[PDB]
mmCIF file of N, CA, C and O in Angstrom:
data_model
loop_
_atom_site.group_PDB
_atom_site.id
_atom_site.type_symbol
_atom_site.label_atom_id
_atom_site.label_comp_id
_atom_site.label_asym_id
_atom_site.label_seq_id
_atom_site.Cartn_x
_atom_site.Cartn_y
_atom_site.Cartn_z
ATOM 1 N N UNK A 1 -9.546 -34.191 1.519
ATOM 2 C CA UNK A 1 -10.278 -34.575 2.470
ATOM 3 C C UNK A 1 -11.189 -35.229 2.582
ATOM 4 O O UNK A 1 -12.238 -34.774 0.866
ATOM 5 N N UNK A 2 -11.513 -36.871 2.766
ATOM 6 C CA UNK A 2 -12.575 -37.174 2.508
ATOM 7 C C UNK A 2 -13.901 -36.343 3.839
ATOM 8 O O UNK A 2 -13.822 -37.539 5.024
ATOM 9 N N UNK A 3 -14.465 -35.196 3.978
ATOM 10 C CA UNK A 3 -14.956 -35.039 4.847
ATOM 11 C C UNK A 3 -16.811 -35.636 5.053
ATOM 12 O O UNK A 3 -17.311 -36.023 4.152
ATOM 13 N N UNK A 4 -16.480 -35.919 6.231
ATOM 14 C CA UNK A 4 -17.743 -36.647 6.556
ATOM 15 C C UNK A 4 -18.902 -35.739 7.806
ATOM 16 O O UNK A 4 -18.081 -35.401 8.702
ATOM 17 N N UNK A 5 -20.269 -35.803 7.701
ATOM 18 C CA UNK A 5 -21.048 -35.120 8.940
ATOM 19 C C UNK A 5 -20.679 -35.176 9.997
ATOM 20 O O UNK A 5 -21.090 -35.282 10.863
ATOM 21 N N UNK A 6 -20.039 -36.483 10.135
ATOM 22 C CA UNK A 6 -19.809 -36.729 11.453
ATOM 23 C C UNK A 6 -18.536 -37.164 12.022
ATOM 24 O O UNK A 6 -17.901 -38.476 12.458
ATOM 25 N N UNK A 7 -18.074 -36.186 11.709
ATOM 26 C CA UNK A 7 -16.537 -36.020 12.028
ATOM 27 C C UNK A 7 -16.435 -35.359 13.490
ATOM 28 O O UNK A 7 -17.031 -34.457 13.278
ATOM 29 N N UNK A 8 -15.571 -35.424 14.370
ATOM 30 C CA UNK A 8 -15.117 -34.732 15.226
ATOM 31 C C UNK A 8 -14.400 -33.847 15.266
ATOM 32 O O UNK A 8 -13.952 -32.799 14.056
ATOM 33 N N UNK A 9 -15.005 -32.524 16.160
ATOM 34 C CA UNK A 9 -14.804 -31.299 15.501
ATOM 35 C C UNK A 9 -12.716 -31.363 15.220
ATOM 36 O O UNK A 9 -12.266 -32.030 15.885
ATOM 37 N N UNK A 10 -12.284 -30.331 14.445
ATOM 38 C CA UNK A 10 -11.364 -30.974 14.316
ATOM 39 C C UNK A 10 -10.794 -31.407 13.207
ATOM 40 O O UNK A 10 -9.783 -31.677 13.039
ATOM 41 N N UNK A 11 -12.000 -32.176 12.709
ATOM 42 C CA UNK A 11 -11.590 -32.555 11.259
ATOM 43 C C UNK A 11 -12.742 -32.198 10.751
ATOM 44 O O UNK A 11 -13.213 -32.774 9.367
ATOM 45 N N UNK A 12 -14.152 -31.304 10.802
ATOM 46 C CA UNK A 12 -14.675 -30.589 9.944
ATOM 47 C C UNK A 12 -14.450 -29.679 9.263
ATOM 48 O O UNK A 12 -13.123 -29.127 9.592
ATOM 49 N N UNK A 13 -14.808 -29.092 8.295
ATOM 50 C CA UNK A 13 -14.456 -27.891 7.557
ATOM 51 C C UNK A 13 -14.573 -26.674 7.744
ATOM 52 O O UNK A 13 -15.738 -26.238 8.223
ATOM 53 N N UNK A 14 -13.103 -25.745 7.382
ATOM 54 C CA UNK A 14 -13.682 -24.412 7.978
ATOM 55 C C UNK A 14 -13.409 -23.906 7.283
ATOM 56 O O UNK A 14 -12.209 -24.327 6.066
ATOM 57 N N UNK A 15 -13.924 -22.575 7.077
ATOM 58 C CA UNK A 15 -13.435 -21.983 5.609
ATOM 59 C C UNK A 15 -12.633 -20.631 6.100
ATOM 60 O O UNK A 15 -13.105 -20.131 7.505
ATOM 61 N N UNK A 16 -11.800 -20.098 5.165
ATOM 62 C CA UNK A 16 -10.994 -19.444 6.285
ATOM 63 C C UNK A 16 -10.836 -17.925 4.552
ATOM 64 O O UNK A 16 -10.732 -18.230 3.963
ATOM 65 N N UNK A 17 -10.573 -16.813 5.206
ATOM 66 C CA UNK A 17 -10.314 -15.566 4.574
ATOM 67 C C UNK A 17 -9.214 -14.566 5.351
ATOM 68 O O UNK A 17 -9.393 -14.480 6.483
ATOM 69 N N UNK A 18 -8.251 -14.528 4.323
ATOM 70 C CA UNK A 18 -7.326 -13.865 4.699
ATOM 71 C C UNK A 18 -7.256 -12.552 4.464
ATOM 72 O O UNK A 18 -6.768 -12.550 2.974
ATOM 73 N N UNK A 19 -7.423 -11.491 5.126
ATOM 74 C CA UNK A 19 -7.440 -9.840 4.560
ATOM 75 C C UNK A 19 -5.802 -9.783 5.108
ATOM 76 O O UNK A 19 -5.123 -9.842 5.523
ATOM 77 N N UNK A 20 -4.939 -9.353 3.968
ATOM 78 C CA UNK A 20 -4.037 -8.406 3.576
ATOM 79 C C UNK A 20 -4.378 -7.470 3.303
ATOM 80 O O UNK A 20 -4.301 -7.074 2.475
ATOM 81 N N UNK A 21 -3.867 -5.980 3.900
ATOM 82 C CA UNK A 21 -3.887 -4.801 3.401
ATOM 83 C C UNK A 21 -2.330 -4.489 3.303
ATOM 84 O O UNK A 21 -1.042 -4.815 4.124
ATOM 85 N N UNK A 22 -2.204 -3.747 2.208
ATOM 86 C CA UNK A 22 -0.888 -3.240 1.821
ATOM 87 C C UNK A 22 -0.321 -1.939 1.212
ATOM 88 O O UNK A 22 -1.842 -1.075 0.905
ATOM 89 N N UNK A 23 0.256 -1.594 1.829
ATOM 90 C CA UNK A 23 0.852 0.293 1.058
ATOM 91 C C UNK A 23 2.046 0.392 -0.310
ATOM 92 O O UNK A 23 3.070 0.672 0.318
ATOM 93 N N UNK A 24 1.247 0.336 -0.626
ATOM 94 C CA UNK A 24 2.708 0.639 -1.599
ATOM 95 C C UNK A 24 3.297 2.076 -1.909
ATOM 96 O O UNK A 24 3.574 2.022 -1.350
ATOM 97 N N UNK A 25 3.258 2.247 -2.814
ATOM 98 C CA UNK A 25 3.586 3.822 -2.906
ATOM 99 C C UNK A 25 2.519 5.119 -3.672
ATOM 100 O O UNK A 25 3.305 5.457 -4.189
ATOM 101 N N UNK A 26 0.991 5.018 -3.957
ATOM 102 C CA UNK A 26 0.002 5.611 -4.442
ATOM 103 C C UNK A 26 -0.499 6.664 -3.875
ATOM 104 O O UNK A 26 0.489 6.981 -2.741
ATOM 105 N N UNK A 27 -1.399 7.476 -4.339
ATOM 106 C CA UNK A 27 -1.859 8.161 -3.468
ATOM 107 C C UNK A 27 -2.670 8.289 -2.670
ATOM 108 O O UNK A 27 -2.911 9.063 -1.537
ATOM 109 N N UNK A 28 -3.370 7.332 -2.686
ATOM 110 C CA UNK A 28 -4.447 6.672 -1.572
ATOM 111 C C UNK A 28 -4.989 5.997 -2.097
ATOM 112 O O UNK A 28 -5.011 5.374 -3.126
ATOM 113 N N UNK A 29 -6.469 5.358 -1.525
ATOM 114 C CA UNK A 29 -7.345 4.340 -1.896
ATOM 115 C C UNK A 29 -8.320 3.769 -0.489
ATOM 116 O O UNK A 29 -8.442 4.971 0.210
ATOM 117 N N UNK A 30 -8.724 3.103 -0.414
ATOM 118 C CA UNK A 30 -9.989 2.631 0.544
ATOM 119 C C UNK A 30 -9.503 2.754 1.812
ATOM 120 O O UNK A 30 -8.646 2.393 2.294
ATOM 121 N N UNK A 31 -10.452 3.111 2.814
ATOM 122 C CA UNK A 31 -10.056 3.173 4.169
ATOM 123 C C UNK A 31 -11.908 2.920 4.817
ATOM 124 O O UNK A 31 -12.766 2.719 4.464
ATOM 125 N N UNK A 32 -11.366 3.347 6.285
ATOM 126 C CA UNK A 32 -12.466 3.145 7.262
ATOM 127 C C UNK A 32 -13.779 3.721 6.413
ATOM 128 O O UNK A 32 -13.830 4.082 5.647
ATOM 129 N N UNK A 33 -14.402 4.712 7.555
ATOM 130 C CA UNK A 33 -15.889 5.271 7.328
ATOM 131 C C UNK A 33 -15.137 6.852 7.154
ATOM 132 O O UNK A 33 -15.243 7.688 6.553
ATOM 133 N N UNK A 34 -14.351 7.309 8.566
ATOM 134 C CA UNK A 34 -14.297 9.096 8.623
ATOM 135 C C UNK A 34 -15.034 9.847 8.411
ATOM 136 O O UNK A 34 -16.031 9.775 8.855
ATOM 137 N N UNK A 35 -14.888 11.198 8.206
ATOM 138 C CA UNK A 35 -15.817 12.254 8.234
ATOM 139 C C UNK A 35 -15.600 13.473 7.379
ATOM 140 O O UNK A 35 -16.223 14.551 7.080
ATOM 141 N N UNK A 36 -14.437 13.484 7.462
ATOM 142 C CA UNK A 36 -13.146 14.610 6.686
ATOM 143 C C UNK A 36 -14.070 16.167 7.386
ATOM 144 O O UNK A 36 -14.814 15.850 8.197
ATOM 145 N N UNK A 37 -13.506 16.852 6.551
ATOM 146 C CA UNK A 37 -13.833 18.229 7.288
ATOM 147 C C UNK A 37 -13.166 19.380 6.445
ATOM 148 O O UNK A 37 -12.315 19.370 5.585
ATOM 149 N N UNK A 38 -13.325 21.118 6.374
ATOM 150 C CA UNK A 38 -12.574 21.702 5.865
ATOM 151 C C UNK A 38 -11.049 21.967 6.496
ATOM 152 O O UNK A 38 -10.227 20.830 6.040
ATOM 153 N N UNK A 39 -10.623 22.853 6.510
ATOM 154 C CA UNK A 39 -9.132 23.553 6.705
ATOM 155 C C UNK A 39 -8.422 24.945 7.066
ATOM 156 O O UNK A 39 -9.021 25.799 6.560
ATOM 157 N N UNK A 40 -7.898 25.015 8.499
ATOM 158 C CA UNK A 40 -7.643 25.815 8.694
ATOM 159 C C UNK A 40 -6.743 26.431 8.161
ATOM 160 O O UNK A 40 -5.846 25.740 7.192
ATOM 161 N N UNK A 41 -5.801 27.479 8.892
ATOM 162 C CA UNK A 41 -4.531 28.125 8.145
ATOM 163 C C UNK A 41 -3.567 28.867 9.409
ATOM 164 O O UNK A 41 -4.335 29.810 9.966
ATOM 165 N N UNK A 42 -2.754 28.542 9.421
ATOM 166 C CA UNK A 42 -1.275 29.346 10.540
ATOM 167 C C UNK A 42 -2.360 28.636 12.219
ATOM 168 O O UNK A 42 -1.754 28.996 13.136
ATOM 169 N N UNK A 43 -3.077 27.700 12.189
ATOM 170 C CA UNK A 43 -4.184 27.505 13.709
ATOM 171 C C UNK A 43 -3.902 25.843 13.693
ATOM 172 O O UNK A 43 -3.937 25.056 13.286
ATOM 173 N N UNK A 44 -2.266 26.015 14.669
ATOM 174 C CA UNK A 44 -1.941 24.897 15.421
ATOM 175 C C UNK A 44 -3.109 23.583 15.025
ATOM 176 O O UNK A 44 -4.008 23.832 16.065
ATOM 177 N N UNK A 45 -2.911 22.634 14.200
ATOM 178 C CA UNK A 45 -4.140 22.074 14.502
ATOM 179 C C UNK A 45 -3.221 20.598 14.378
ATOM 180 O O UNK A 45 -2.264 20.304 14.156
ATOM 181 N N UNK A 46 -4.592 19.565 14.233
ATOM 182 C CA UNK A 46 -4.160 17.863 14.375
ATOM 183 C C UNK A 46 -5.325 17.368 13.252
ATOM 184 O O UNK A 46 -6.057 17.485 13.628
ATOM 185 N N UNK A 47 -3.946 16.772 12.091
ATOM 186 C CA UNK A 47 -4.684 16.858 11.066
ATOM 187 C C UNK A 47 -4.621 15.231 10.724
ATOM 188 O O UNK A 47 -3.437 14.596 11.094
ATOM 189 N N UNK A 48 -5.032 14.773 9.822
ATOM 190 C CA UNK A 48 -5.214 13.518 8.843
ATOM 191 C C UNK A 48 -5.250 13.859 7.685
ATOM 192 O O UNK A 48 -6.463 14.041 7.307
ATOM 193 N N UNK A 49 -3.941 13.668 6.739
ATOM 194 C CA UNK A 49 -4.369 13.398 5.381
ATOM 195 C C UNK A 49 -4.043 12.081 4.452
ATOM 196 O O UNK A 49 -3.133 11.211 4.474
ATOM 197 N N UNK B 1 22.895 -5.684 -34.448
ATOM 198 C CA UNK B 1 24.308 -5.009 -33.982
ATOM 199 C C UNK B 1 23.652 -4.100 -32.621
ATOM 200 O O UNK B 1 22.728 -4.709 -31.727
ATOM 201 N N UNK B 2 24.747 -4.013 -31.755
ATOM 202 C CA UNK B 2 24.944 -3.752 -30.389
ATOM 203 C C UNK B 2 25.645 -2.388 -30.050
ATOM 204 O O UNK B 2 26.248 -1.596 -31.142
ATOM 205 N N UNK B 3 24.913 -1.790 -29.182
ATOM 206 C CA UNK B 3 25.498 -0.015 -29.138
ATOM 207 C C UNK B 3 25.716 -0.013 -27.452
ATOM 208 O O UNK B 3 25.382 -0.611 -26.466
ATOM 209 N N UNK B 4 25.899 1.470 -27.185
ATOM 210 C CA UNK B 4 26.288 1.246 -26.250
ATOM 211 C C UNK B 4 25.424 2.708 -25.187
ATOM 212 O O UNK B 4 25.318 3.848 -25.849
ATOM 213 N N UNK B 5 24.929 2.261 -24.473
ATOM 214 C CA UNK B 5 23.966 3.603 -23.576
ATOM 215 C C UNK B 5 25.254 4.672 -22.740
ATOM 216 O O UNK B 5 26.106 4.077 -22.489
ATOM 217 N N UNK B 6 24.886 5.304 -22.136
ATOM 218 C CA UNK B 6 25.537 6.315 -21.968
ATOM 219 C C UNK B 6 25.168 6.168 -20.766
ATOM 220 O O UNK B 6 25.944 6.178 -19.641
ATOM 221 N N UNK B 7 24.618 7.357 -20.452
ATOM 222 C CA UNK B 7 23.513 7.710 -19.552
ATOM 223 C C UNK B 7 21.663 7.613 -19.719
ATOM 224 O O UNK B 7 21.776 9.226 -19.496
ATOM 225 N N UNK B 8 21.522 6.735 -19.059
ATOM 226 C CA UNK B 8 20.071 6.292 -20.142
ATOM 227 C C UNK B 8 19.010 5.372 -19.133
ATOM 228 O O UNK B 8 20.158 4.429 -18.959
ATOM 229 N N UNK B 9 18.030 5.354 -18.779
ATOM 230 C CA UNK B 9 16.844 4.567 -17.993
ATOM 231 C C UNK B 9 17.390 5.251 -16.659
ATOM 232 O O UNK B 9 17.041 3.955 -15.753
ATOM 233 N N UNK B 10 16.881 6.314 -16.492
ATOM 234 C CA UNK B 10 16.641 6.513 -14.545
ATOM 235 C C UNK B 10 15.177 6.953 -14.595
ATOM 236 O O UNK B 10 15.008 8.095 -15.354
ATOM 237 N N UNK B 11 14.354 6.628 -13.727
ATOM 238 C CA UNK B 11 13.308 6.614 -13.786
ATOM 239 C C UNK B 11 12.956 7.336 -11.903
ATOM 240 O O UNK B 11 14.194 6.858 -11.219
ATOM 241 N N UNK B 12 12.108 8.252 -11.697
ATOM 242 C CA UNK B 12 11.799 8.582 -10.276
ATOM 243 C C UNK B 12 11.308 7.080 -9.682
ATOM 244 O O UNK B 12 10.272 6.609 -10.185
ATOM 245 N N UNK B 13 11.757 6.868 -8.395
ATOM 246 C CA UNK B 13 11.828 5.676 -7.794
ATOM 247 C C UNK B 13 10.540 5.581 -7.526
ATOM 248 O O UNK B 13 9.709 4.453 -6.590
ATOM 249 N N UNK B 14 9.978 6.411 -7.450
ATOM 250 C CA UNK B 14 8.715 6.803 -6.318
ATOM 251 C C UNK B 14 7.842 7.871 -6.538
ATOM 252 O O UNK B 14 8.575 9.006 -6.881
ATOM 253 N N UNK B 15 7.215 8.341 -5.792
ATOM 254 C CA UNK B 15 6.295 9.758 -5.758
ATOM 255 C C UNK B 15 6.976 10.741 -4.250
ATOM 256 O O UNK B 15 8.547 10.161 -4.581
ATOM 257 N N UNK B 16 6.781 11.594 -3.718
ATOM 258 C CA UNK B 16 7.149 12.194 -3.034
ATOM 259 C C UNK B 16 7.856 13.189 -3.630
ATOM 260 O O UNK B 16 9.030 12.505 -3.990
ATOM 261 N N UNK B 17 7.578 14.499 -3.627
ATOM 262 C CA UNK B 17 8.277 15.745 -4.285
ATOM 263 C C UNK B 17 9.846 15.287 -3.477
ATOM 264 O O UNK B 17 10.394 14.591 -2.816
ATOM 265 N N UNK B 18 10.976 16.686 -3.844
ATOM 266 C CA UNK B 18 12.282 16.524 -3.584
ATOM 267 C C UNK B 18 13.134 17.637 -3.912
ATOM 268 O O UNK B 18 12.829 17.228 -5.663
ATOM 269 N N UNK B 19 14.410 18.188 -3.535
ATOM 270 C CA UNK B 19 14.850 19.143 -3.931
ATOM 271 C C UNK B 19 16.551 18.803 -3.695
ATOM 272 O O UNK B 19 16.480 17.552 -3.565
ATOM 273 N N UNK B 20 17.055 19.543 -4.069
ATOM 274 C CA UNK B 20 18.699 19.599 -3.985
ATOM 275 C C UNK B 20 18.545 18.750 -2.850
ATOM 276 O O UNK B 20 19.491 19.282 -1.657
ATOM 277 N N UNK B 21 19.116 17.684 -3.400
ATOM 278 C CA UNK B 21 19.712 16.102 -1.827
ATOM 279 C C UNK B 21 19.513 14.935 -2.741
ATOM 280 O O UNK B 21 18.960 13.836 -3.116
ATOM 281 N N UNK B 22 21.045 15.361 -2.993
ATOM 282 C CA UNK B 22 22.029 13.852 -3.244
ATOM 283 C C UNK B 22 21.339 12.626 -2.494
ATOM 284 O O UNK B 22 22.157 12.110 -1.713
ATOM 285 N N UNK B 23 20.077 12.193 -2.775
ATOM 286 C CA UNK B 23 19.523 11.092 -2.565
ATOM 287 C C UNK B 23 20.362 9.848 -3.139
ATOM 288 O O UNK B 23 20.651 9.654 -4.176
ATOM 289 N N UNK B 24 19.915 8.675 -2.164
ATOM 290 C CA UNK B 24 20.660 7.491 -2.188
ATOM 291 C C UNK B 24 19.910 6.161 -2.357
ATOM 292 O O UNK B 24 18.876 6.176 -1.390
#
């Protein structure tokens, strides 16, 4: 590419980043923020592990 | 020399517990 500052859009350079989330078969890893919490027992609950 | 394995080289394909289950 011979990029030059007086190029019409669509010929100016764009920087690209491709994030690819993968899930092999480990025990866990990085994630959003969350908040975490304790844990009850026998109490029909809505859980996320 | 060459030799014959008999039933060798079986590994757990991954985590996840499991019991009596002829899993394929």
